[PDB]
Each structure stands twice: as structure tokens, then as C-alpha cells.
Design a protein around this nucleic acid. Sequence first.
DNA 1: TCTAAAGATCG
DNA 2: ACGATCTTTAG
Length: 254
Amino acid sequence: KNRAFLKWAGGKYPLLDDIKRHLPKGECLVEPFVGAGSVFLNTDFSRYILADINSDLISLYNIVKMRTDEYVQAARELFVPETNCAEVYYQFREEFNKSQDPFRRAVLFLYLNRYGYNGLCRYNLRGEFNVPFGRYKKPYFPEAELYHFAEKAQNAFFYCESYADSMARADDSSVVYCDPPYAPLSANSFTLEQQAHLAEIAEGLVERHIPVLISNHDTMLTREWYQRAKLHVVKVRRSIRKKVDELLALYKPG
DNA sequence: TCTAAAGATCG
DNA sequence: ACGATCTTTAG
Ligand SMILES: Nc1ncnc2c1ncn2[C@@H]1O[C@H](C[C@@H](N)CC[C@H](N)C(=O)O)[C@@H](O)[C@H]1O
């Protein structure tokens, strides 16, 4: 069991056993919504193609892969007792938003992920990061996790683009896993129109003998979008009050 | 998930 | 120059 080095929304570490039970075998794995990378880090394919719409995240992954020793030594200097203070936090956030150097922006990005409020990621319409101070007791510097990420990445390529464009890179030796933002539980972001279009693209790939696996909440809407697949219920019963389970859908060819 | 200030849109 | 009703911002 291997851990990511970033805090992130909708991370899949606790569901890995159920995912690996139903995921097919092949030469190359494609992830159109990669995020913090928990599945990439806990599987064994010989090639990977990894993509996301967030451009600060993709640039950080390129620096860590190609300039490893230089990156670690510089980032370690920001994790000391002197920097756990509100007046210092708001000046570093300001330096980040004004800089135009990829290496310096990547160093500061990790500090903000581990000292900021509840570990969030949020921006305004101008592209400035605006999460406030978090006040933790003693944050942890993920050194071991950073070296292991660099090592596995020697066999992957990274891209900044949307889900229709990355899914079109697949060929007759590939396998695809999708993890989109969650569907709503009651009546800008990922739209209803977009949730349905994703299911349509999957039905077209499976005609070409290319297999696909998807995950989301178990509701009335998701059962309708994914009607042409085989469905498996995962009991979780998380409160809020009511219980909700999770769902997996598998498209397999003949 | 929350809320007091500031800016956007139409007749 | 006016006012009712929405969006947007950031602790
Ligand atoms: N149109 C889009 N195309 C591609 N990625 C998107 C799009 N919209 C949102 N995303 C990303 O989808 C990701 C959703 C995450 N929940 C995935 C978590 C990931 N499985 C992990 O283990 O960390 C986010 O990182 C988004 O930035």
C-alpha cells in the first residue's frame, strides 16, 4: 500500500481492493481524471497516459520527475517551526500569485497544500489562489513519498487537456478508468450535460474492443446513465441524514 | 455548508 | 440617474 504526497478531494485510497477486483489486464492504462494518483501508485502496468484540467498540477508533476534532487532540498527549507504563523502564510500566498517562474511556483504549491485550511484547492475568476490559513499543530514533510513517485513516473507521459481529447489517445492495447466529480444528491462546475456525454463516449470505445471502468455514487440518475453496463454495489453507508452507497460500472466487449 | 460587502444585468 | 434581484469574493 503506497501513499500520495498531496491532500486531495475524492481520493480513492480506501476503495482500492474493490477497484482491483474488476479492472481488466493489458499493456497500457489511461486516466482522464488523474488527481493525486492513488490508482497509478498501486497497480503494475508497463505504460501509463495521465491527464487533468488543472495546469498548476500537471506542471508540478513534470518538475518532480526531471529535477528530483534539486526539488527536494529546496522544499525542505519551508517546513520549519518559524513558518507556522498567519502573517508569514499570507505573504507566501502573495509571492506565488505574482511569480512567473515554474520551478519557484512548484516549490510554494506544496507548502500551501499542507498548511492551508482543511487542505482545500480554490481560485477566483482571475486565476488567483485564495484559501485562508489552517492552524494545524505539526505538519508532515512527505520525503519518502516524493522519491517513490519520481521512480514510477519514468514510464509515464503527462497532459493538460479535457476528457474527450485524452480518451481519443487510446488504441487496441489499452484499458481506461474514469473517476469524475460526484453527482448531486438534490436540486460553473461539472454539469449534468457533461455527466451524460461521458457515458456516450464509453459506449463507442467498447464497440472497438476497448474496455472501460467507471465510479460514482449510487443514485437514480447514475443507474440510468450507465444502463448498458454491468453494475456492482459497494456498501459504505456514510451518514449525511441518510446513508449512501457507492457504485462501479463495467463495459466489456465480446 | 455559512454570510456581510462589492460588482453585474435588465426594463 | 433609478431600483429589484442575482453573482462573485474570501475569511
Ligand atoms: N473536464 C474535466 N476534464 C478532465 N478533468 C477534470 C475535468 N473537470 C474536473 N477535472 C478533474 O477531475 C478530478 C476529480 C478527482 N475526484 C479525481 C480523484 C483521483 N481519483 C485521486 O485518486 O486523487 C479533479 O482533479 C479535477 O481537476
